[PDB]
Write a protein that binds this ligand. Structure first.
Ligand SMILES: [Pt+2]
Ligand SMILES: [Pt+2]
Length: 129
């Protein structure tokens, strides 16, 4: 599923990402935009052999098992294909663990390089929330 901007802000808010560990909703929507273009089906291969899955591009190196990432962890204890559903629950619930692990949103390379330090509130402008 490809979400609209405000549609995803609302889903993220419902699942408790609004200011989760101090990251305003605009951060999360910005991260989604530049990670997946709001596409729950997005998958991308990393140079190390791991793959990033779903709307927040969660990596099989650490967070999920995709059957083909040797010597990796599965810290959200899920198959990586769970992160590709049209329901974002699994991605959100795993993102909560990732962002709580000491590195905050810096775990998302697109967030660091394209959202961090920017006027992220623009990402939720005009949405009924
Ligand atoms: Pt939902
Ligand atoms: Pt939830």
């Amino acid at each position: 599923k490809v979400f609209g901007r405000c549609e995803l802000a609302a889903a993220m808010k419902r699942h408790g990402l609004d200011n989760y560990r101090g990251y305003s909703l605009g951060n999360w929507v910005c991260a989604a935009k530049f990670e997946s273009n709001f596409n729950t089906q997005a998958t991308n291969r990393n140079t190390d052999g791991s793959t990033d899955y779903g709307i927040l591009q969660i990596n099989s190196r650490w967070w999920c098992n995709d059957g083909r990432t040797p010597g990796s962890r599965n810290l959200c204890n899920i198959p990586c294909s769970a992160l590709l559903s049209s329901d974002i629950t699994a991605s959100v619930n795993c993102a909560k663990k990732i962002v709580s692990d000491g590195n905050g949103m810096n775990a998302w390379v697109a967030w660091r390089n394209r959202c961090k330090g920017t006027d992220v509130q623009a990402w939720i402008r005009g949405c009924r929330l």
